[PDB]
Design a protein around this ligand. Structure first.
Ligand SMILES: CC(C)[C@H](NC(=O)CCc1ccccc1)P(=O)(O)C[C@@H](CCCCCN)C(=O)O
Ligand SMILES: [Zn+2]
Ligand SMILES: [Zn+2]
Length: 304
């Protein structure tokens, strides 16, 4: 039984992708962009009313298995799109004019493992040469200063960069999807938790993107917007100096592909519950995050 106000296991979320697609055929279509290490389908939802030459925003959740509020958020975004389409002017305009690719869970194998065996697992569940230690950090696995700072070379470490950039089936599938759809994807959003932040490039070195001032202003206004609802305080800025250096990130990789609006979100909280954010915070967290995401979406729409 799926609920947007609880954490849903992978079987539930997978059935939800199919059902939400069936119930909303004018607004949603579903594809699989690849399969995981363990062979699970990586589903992707395309949310938007059909039309010609539509720009797109790409958003993924569930890079990191233990970050359950991330997975819940991508589901909430879809909830909002279908519920409010037609009644709320902004969401209606967004869906009419842009497509949203929502990838509800990238690291499906890790997610299953947090439900069955280890709530605090972060990495993929693939094997490594020369050791019994499992998995790669998918957010150290992209070809963006790959494996150079803030990433480990030890397969037993939580930030292990992998055997090569895109060595993981899941990160290969996401990078392939983005490469194949580069001319339409105008923004890349990647949802994580916790620590309450809106980050933009760069994390792989202490350097700033060409459109630094624009991304800084946008991130500042989006955090201001998020706080309107419950007063939740976010920080923002370039990854390396705002959270820590961390090479091989998907936001930096996406940005270096030419996608000018590339953000990583770090949802609630600031450490009281950390990864184990209680289900009773799902609603408030997703609602205030919707305000930031809609703010970014509206800006992208207005600055094509
Ligand atoms: C708690 C958050 C910050 C997660 N970080 C961790 O789980 C690493 C371990 C940790 C660090 C800080 C507090 C608690 C745990 P995260 O969401 O996974 C942070 C992201 C930040 C990457 C750099 C910015 C975007 N390129 C990551 O480490 O991949
Ligand atoms: Zn994360
Ligand atoms: Zn709402």
């Amino acid at each position: 039984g799926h609920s947007y106000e609880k954490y849903n296991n992978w079987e539930t979320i997978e059935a939800w992708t199919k059902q939400v697609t069936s119930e909303n055929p004018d607004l949603i279509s579903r594809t699989a962009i690849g399969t995981t290490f363990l062979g699970n389908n990586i589903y992707l939802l395309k949310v938007g009313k059909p039309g010609p030459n539509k720009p797109a925003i790409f958003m993924d959740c569930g890079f990191h298995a233990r970050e359950w509020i991330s997975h819940a958020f991508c589901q909430w975004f879809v909830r909002e799109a279908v519920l409010t389409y037609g009644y709320e002017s902004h969401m209606t305009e967004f869906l009419n004019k842009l497509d949203f690719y929502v990838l509800p869970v990238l690291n499906i194998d890790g997610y299953i493992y947090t439900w069955t065996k280890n709530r605090m697992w972060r990495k993929t569940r693939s094997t490594n040469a020369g050791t019994t230690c499992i998995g790669t950090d998918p957010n150290r696995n992209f070809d963006a200063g790959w494996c150079t700072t803030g990433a480990s070379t030890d397969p037993c470490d939580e930030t292990y960069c992998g055997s090569a950039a895109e060595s993981e089936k899941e990160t290969k599938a996401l990078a392939d999807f983005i490469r194949n759809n580069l001319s339409s994807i105008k923004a890349y959003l990647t949802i994580h938790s916790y620590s309450q932040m809106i980050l933009y490039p760069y994390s792989y070195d202490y350097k700033l993107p060409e459109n630094n001032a624009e991304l800084n202003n946008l991130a500042k206004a989006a955090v201001k917007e998020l706080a309107t609802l419950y007063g939740t305080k976010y920080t923002y800025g370039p990854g390396a100096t705002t959270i820590y250096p961390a090479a091989g990130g998907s936001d930096d990789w996406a940005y270096d592909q030419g996608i000018k609006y590339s953000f990583t979100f770090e949802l609630r909280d600031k450490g009281r519950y950390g990864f184990i954010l209680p289900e009773s915070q799902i609603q408030a967290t997703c609602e205030e995050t919707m305000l930031a995401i809609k703010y970014v979406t509206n800006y992208v729409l207005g600055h094509l």
